[PDB]
Design a protein around this motif. Sequence first.
Motif, PDB file in Angstrom:
ATOM      1  N   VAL A   1       0.847  -1.184   0.000  1.00 32.15           N
ATOM      2  CA  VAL A   1       0.000   0.000   0.000  1.00 32.15           C
ATOM      3  C   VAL A   1       0.885   1.237   0.000  1.00 32.15           C
ATOM      4  N   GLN A   2       2.103   1.102  -0.515  1.00 32.83           N
ATOM      5  CA  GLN A   2       3.080   2.177  -0.381  1.00 32.83           C
ATOM      6  C   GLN A   2       2.653   3.434  -1.127  1.00 32.83           C
TER       7      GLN A   2
ATOM      8  N   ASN B   1       0.223  10.559   6.246  1.00 30.53           N
ATOM      9  CA  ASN B   1       0.071   9.626   7.350  1.00 30.53           C
ATOM     10  C   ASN B   1      -0.489   8.303   6.862  1.00 30.53           C
ATOM     11  N   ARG B   2      -0.073   7.208   7.487  1.00 37.48           N
ATOM     12  CA  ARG B   2      -0.779   5.956   7.263  1.00 37.48           C
ATOM     13  C   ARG B   2      -2.152   6.006   7.903  1.00 37.48           C
ATOM     14  N   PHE B   3      -2.247   6.627   9.077  1.00 36.51           N
ATOM     15  CA  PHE B   3      -3.507   6.648   9.805  1.00 36.51           C
ATOM     16  C   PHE B   3      -4.570   7.432   9.052  1.00 36.51           C
TER      17      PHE B   3
ATOM     18  N   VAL C   1      -5.886   5.203   6.374  1.00 33.99           N
ATOM     19  CA  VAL C   1      -6.834   4.209   6.861  1.00 33.99           C
ATOM     20  C   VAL C   1      -8.202   4.835   7.035  1.00 33.99           C
ATOM     21  N   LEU C   2      -8.254   6.013   7.646  1.00 40.95           N
ATOM     22  CA  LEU C   2      -9.552   6.615   7.927  1.00 40.95           C
ATOM     23  C   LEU C   2     -10.282   6.995   6.643  1.00 40.95           C
TER      24      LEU C   2
ATOM     25  N   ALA D   1      -9.844   5.845   3.506  1.00 36.45           N
ATOM     26  CA  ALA D   1     -10.236   4.688   2.726  1.00 36.45           C
ATOM     27  C   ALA D   1     -11.369   3.936   3.398  1.00 36.45           C
ATOM     28  N   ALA D   2     -11.430   3.961   4.728  1.00 38.73           N
ATOM     29  CA  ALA D   2     -12.533   3.306   5.417  1.00 38.73           C
ATOM     30  C   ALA D   2     -13.852   3.993   5.116  1.00 38.73           C
TER      31      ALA D   2
ATOM     32  N   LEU E   1     -14.782  -2.752   8.505  1.00 43.15           N
ATOM     33  CA  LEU E   1     -13.964  -2.241   7.412  1.00 43.15           C
ATOM     34  C   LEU E   1     -12.702  -1.572   7.915  1.00 43.15           C
ATOM     35  N   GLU E   2     -12.785  -0.815   9.000  1.00 46.44           N
ATOM     36  CA  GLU E   2     -11.595  -0.159   9.517  1.00 46.44           C
ATOM     37  C   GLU E   2     -10.571  -1.175   9.989  1.00 46.44           C
TER      38      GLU E   2
ATOM     39  N   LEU F   1      -8.860  -2.613   6.969  1.00 44.50           N
ATOM     40  CA  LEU F   1      -7.947  -1.682   6.328  1.00 44.50           C
ATOM     41  C   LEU F   1      -6.666  -1.536   7.118  1.00 44.50           C
TER      42      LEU F   1
ATOM     43  N   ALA G   1      -2.888  -2.149   5.969  1.00 45.48           N
ATOM     44  CA  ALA G   1      -1.985  -1.018   5.807  1.00 45.48           C
ATOM     45  C   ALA G   1      -0.909  -0.988   6.881  1.00 45.48           C
ATOM     46  N   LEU G   2      -1.286  -1.175   8.140  1.00 49.40           N
ATOM     47  CA  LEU G   2      -0.307  -1.055   9.212  1.00 49.40           C
ATOM     48  C   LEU G   2       0.397  -2.367   9.515  1.00 49.40           C
TER      49      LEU G   2
ATOM     50  N   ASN H   1       4.771  -4.925   4.959  1.00 46.87           N
ATOM     51  CA  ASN H   1       5.063  -3.582   5.434  1.00 46.87           C
ATOM     52  C   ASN H   1       6.128  -3.576   6.513  1.00 46.87           C
TER      53      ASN H   1
ATOM     54  N   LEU I   1      10.447  -0.223  -1.928  1.00 47.72           N
ATOM     55  CA  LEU I   1       9.862  -1.330  -1.185  1.00 47.72           C
ATOM     56  C   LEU I   1       9.481  -2.490  -2.098  1.00 47.72           C
TER      57      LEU I   1
ATOM     58  N   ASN J   1       5.760  10.111  12.367  1.00 43.73           N
ATOM     59  CA  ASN J   1       4.439  10.678  12.162  1.00 43.73           C
ATOM     60  C   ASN J   1       3.844  11.147  13.473  1.00 43.73           C
TER      61      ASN J   1
ATOM     62  N   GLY K   1      -2.192   6.706  17.117  1.00 44.57           N
ATOM     63  CA  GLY K   1      -2.399   6.160  15.795  1.00 44.57           C
ATOM     64  C   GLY K   1      -3.767   6.510  15.264  1.00 44.57           C
ATOM     65  N   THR K   2      -4.483   5.492  14.809  1.00 44.03           N
ATOM     66  CA  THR K   2      -5.746   5.684  14.120  1.00 44.03           C
ATOM     67  C   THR K   2      -6.755   6.415  14.985  1.00 44.03           C
TER      68      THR K   2
END
Lengths: 77, 41, 1344, 50
Positions: A5-6, A14-16, A19-20, A22-23, C460-461, C464, C468-469, C474, C600, C896, C1328-1329
Amino acid sequence: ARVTVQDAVEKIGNRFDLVLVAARRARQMQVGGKDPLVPEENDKTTVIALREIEEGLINNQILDVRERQEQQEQEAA
Amino acid sequence: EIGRTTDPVRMYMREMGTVELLTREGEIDIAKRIEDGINQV
Amino acid sequence: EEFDAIKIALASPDMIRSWSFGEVKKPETINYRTFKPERDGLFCARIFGPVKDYECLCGKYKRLKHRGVICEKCGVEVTQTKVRRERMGHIELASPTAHIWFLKSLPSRIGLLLDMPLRDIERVLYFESYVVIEGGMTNLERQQILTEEQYLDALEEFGDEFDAKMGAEAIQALLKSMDLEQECEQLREELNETNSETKRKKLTKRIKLLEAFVQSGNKPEWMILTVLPVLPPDLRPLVPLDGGRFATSDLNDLYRRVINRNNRLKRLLDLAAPDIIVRNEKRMLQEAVDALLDNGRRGRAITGSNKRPLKSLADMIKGKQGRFRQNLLGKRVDYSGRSVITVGPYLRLHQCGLPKKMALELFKPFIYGKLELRGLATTIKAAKKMVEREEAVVWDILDEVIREHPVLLNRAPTLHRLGIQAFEPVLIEGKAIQLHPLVCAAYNADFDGDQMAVHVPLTLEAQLEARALMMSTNNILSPANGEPIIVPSQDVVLGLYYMTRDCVNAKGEGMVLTGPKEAERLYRSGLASLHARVKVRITEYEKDANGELVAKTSLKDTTVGRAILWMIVPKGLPYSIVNQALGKKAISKMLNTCYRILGLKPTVIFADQIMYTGFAYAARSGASVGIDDMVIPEKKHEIISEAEAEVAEIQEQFQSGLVTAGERYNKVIDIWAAANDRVSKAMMDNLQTETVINRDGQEEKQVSFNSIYMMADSGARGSAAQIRQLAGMRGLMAKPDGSIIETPITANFREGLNVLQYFISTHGARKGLADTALKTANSGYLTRRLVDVAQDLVVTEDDCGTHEGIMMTPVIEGGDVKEPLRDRVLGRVTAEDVLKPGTADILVPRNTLLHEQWCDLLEENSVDAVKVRSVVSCDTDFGVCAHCYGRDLARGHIINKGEAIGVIAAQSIGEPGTQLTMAAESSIQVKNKGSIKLSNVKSVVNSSGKLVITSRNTELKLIDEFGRTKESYKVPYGAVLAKGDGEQVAGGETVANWDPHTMPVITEVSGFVRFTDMIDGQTITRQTDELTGLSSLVVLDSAERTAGGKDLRPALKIVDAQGNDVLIPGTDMPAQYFLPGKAIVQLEDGVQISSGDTLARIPQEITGGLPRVADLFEARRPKEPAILAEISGIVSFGKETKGKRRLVITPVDGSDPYEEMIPKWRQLNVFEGERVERGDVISDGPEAPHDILRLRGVHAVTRYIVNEVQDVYRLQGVKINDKHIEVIVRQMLRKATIVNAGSSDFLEGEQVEYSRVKIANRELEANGKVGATYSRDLLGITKASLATESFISAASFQETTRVLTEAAVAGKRDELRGLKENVIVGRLIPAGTGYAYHQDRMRRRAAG
Amino acid sequence: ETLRVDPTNDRLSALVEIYRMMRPGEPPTREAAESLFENLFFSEDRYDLS
Ligand SMILES: [Mg+2]
Ligand SMILES: [Zn+2]
Ligand SMILES: [Zn+2]
């Protein structure tokens, strides 16, 4: 995309945040009954959202603009 | 001298040990006094 | 429903009645025939709710017409059943009873309020003595204990004004009457006159309690119970077991006996009993309540019917198996499975094989849903029957469901964050999970019976963030240090090694090939060998200035194997990578290069292809292990026989008495060690390079193709020591504990041991095995403490804007460079740039990330010291800024905002714990050539022309041509030097010389010597020797000095013929060399001493493991701490008192004299008034971190802890970035103590959070006013974690009862900031999220 | 030195000391102390070195 998912992370930051965003887009696709911008290619809604984000179609700003336009039109009628 | 014997059984036995038994005469003495009080009332 | 905070406080009796729905009066539970509950028993339906939903006992008010209406006749309300889980009851005690938690839990809050010793409250409560509540008449006072007869004596006389009581009524009457304001003001005044340190601190703590107790709104009366609440029935169930028996919780029993004693006390009082009986009942009631609230703390635990103590409420909260750790912080989970693991080598890096049956079960409801969608089943029950019979459409649906759905694979113990990873499933038959080979290192898994657990993300979260994480593609770099974790291993390495290596003339020398494709076509047809040395045409690619790939074609000299391997390598890398025989290091470096150049995705694909090729060619090699493969040197027995004969002669020589026991033992050990080394070297020489091949003619010599040697070189599995054991000697062994046995084991495993040798080796075998077994637990406990201290850290800001930092230099311990800069500064932000206009014109811009390129620039300009922004100096409150942190090591960029640093740091430090274990000091010799630069050196020239040093701290260095330091040494006091400063020394030279078992007082000048204030018999002893008649003078100390010669302080006057002492130029000091006690001058009074001669000769004659780091982090005080010099100025001794060494420092400029007591038997390094600075060491021994922090400052203690933790890890070859230890230290310096009267509501001696003081101080300094002055405190891991601003975190950690009591008394309020807090309450963590979510709630504070 | 630190003087005070060490909080009568010591170390049914 499917493997790594690079590119999406590089596109948003941010990755976070990725995520939000795309969710919420995937929820829109799954239950809101919207039409994917990119071809299906037999994919779950999650990966379709990631591919949309990957190439610059869906992003937080665009989602907000779209939703505001829909709300404005709905309230007009 | 109390070695902080927190055991309640020890406290009970220590308290009860002081009062000494008395037989065949006291019982009559106390019974007479009880009946006397009741008769007075 | 929605809330914001949790608060705790004491409960007033009317509050406890407010909770209640009715009071419990009988001890009955249920009826013995019809198991319905009893009228007012512990399980009544009227007060705790109805047993069965919407049905009262009579059933007259039914059919949901009456909602909340109470059916009067049966007393049963018609509502849902769940209420039996939440309604409470109460019990009204006949006599007030003390709450055990507020009585015994030290320091006994009731004791603090009344200022009574605990035993006095004890004696009052147990009806053993009276206490005086109110003496209006002047005879007595409050809180005076009265014995039994003494009360009679006082009553008979005085009477009618004398209030004395006994038991809990008395204590409650005392608390109710006491007025807080009066003592608050009185103690406030009392501290103002006299501060006896002990008295001062106890008054401070009592004032703290009173002030907080007034603020919170609690009243002390409530510490003693009159009403007692009763827990809802369904949390203490009485359930029918299938066999007809009943199972009950213990709280039922404890409640029953409290009720029984209470009822009988009411009966007794109603009946007018004698007083001893009611006293007995009152004690037993109090004991029953104590056993209910906390069993066993009152001394003797009430045992159940069986043998064992009943388990009470506090027991339900506290332990490792209480609620907090076992049901709130971690709990069992649906949608999960478990099984044995097995290797699947055909998988791609992001896949895992999942058995069909497990997958069918885990994804049950998804399958039901899509069976209904397609119309294949009308109703859910039909879907069940479809699944249980396993029809084909079910398998088609399942294959459609799992696609793109990740699952989570876990293997316990989960030491670090890579122990949980997300994979994409591939359905297989069978019952074992198939795991990709490359991820075994991260999991620490081996395929010999392990098991792993599978979890399914649902929303879904969740899906995802699994993709992703957490996805395995990764996680290729480790978060502890930057190095990759995907590292090819045993078979892969063997295959690549065998494929790459070259050999002499074997098939196909000197052909010329049109690229790798012809090489493969040749090898697989049997026309050439993998090892042929051939000339091949190769086209590399190379990345241009702007990322373009320029192509370059050439004709290279290589082998067939390397050419074939080159087809895998992604374009962009040089050919030189492949063109040498690859080992393990080479392959790992190949992957790292591919990562930092290409990205990567190419590295992921490349890692797979490496694995596939390595397996294939390892198999084709057919490497095996026979017994002929362990060759033994032809001359082993000669070495053994020579050593045996030589030891025999040394032992024969012992009986001549020429050799003592220690001599013989040491000699024999040395002999056997030498023999072992000779045998090992001969074996390696015979093994490693033993193949003689004809090169089309005469002979040639090359490295061997022996299979065990291949496993050694390639780094596949073997090592040198193992092979030594297989073919050399097994070596020397140790007795059970320390001693090393004399005769070694001469046999090896090929030859076979005999009985006695095997028995000898068993000792060490079992010792090591038990060590590991009992070391795992200590590792776990350490990492738990670390995780709990530093969890609140999250990256919160972008730039605190601070100008502080830590100066960093490469570590130059001893002779050799332990660590360069590039490992120690890479990926950190430079603050306050260091410029060097001049030699290097050093330009470092502000605030840059040190890439590899910047580090290369630093190397070529060759700079040594750089100041770097660090976490311990960050200025952000409640977090750290991104810039003060640096790289995110796992990802590869600036970190981040919103990531949980603290947990990562604790895990990365605690993870290697398991593998972590459990004198020629004559002169100074330089290893390599260079130039000498001294620092902080006090030198004095003597007549011999040799530089004598008197400075206490003298440091020796070695500046090279480019201007770096290559060595450093500590020159001891009074050591003679060889050369001065400036000249280039030569390799191997000795530069200093001193007496090891002596500290000599060295002379500077010549002249006549006068022995002053030192008399024979009083101060010294006459020593007479033989015919030669050489005498020595030895000064006796004041310990054995006679009473008449006590004031005599020995000294040596240095006079000339006239006696006048020439003064040192410019300085006014008198030449008064008062040498301290035991100044042993062998030469008698009146002997000419040359400059540089010895005056006195006073002789001067380590855990290192897991406990060492546990003690470093816990900030324990070494038993014999070195003492440091507090204040600069003049130093002297003073008047001894009982032998108390008296140390007086009067400052040169400061006026206040500072005195230190010193232990008698400890020695003092400094003699008299010197120029000692802040924290100048004056004694010898281990150093305490507390003192470092007080004297040197925070950066000093950080550097100390970092260095001495990192030694333990370096000694084992464990690489951890220093950043994590810095984070832990930051969290370990959290609190500060106030010494000032500021402008805010603080006090002498208060301990408050450093951030809180910063906020108050900056707030007042924005208004002119002056704030308070503080000093930071250093606390251990456990202390600092138990002192947070949140009782839920501390309470879940450890010592639950104590922290709950303190919080309850003080009326604390928890504001839910940390991660443990939100985890317990079931919310999104603020990291994080979830981070964004909380920040929204934060701005909701603006609109409230 | 132990004698010098030793507070007890005669046999009976020593038995009392042992008795109040073993059973704290009870009055140390003569017979109770005697019986305690005997049953403690010298009685057939309460001590056995097999
Ligand atoms: Mg295993
Ligand atoms: Zn009813
Ligand atoms: Zn900062």
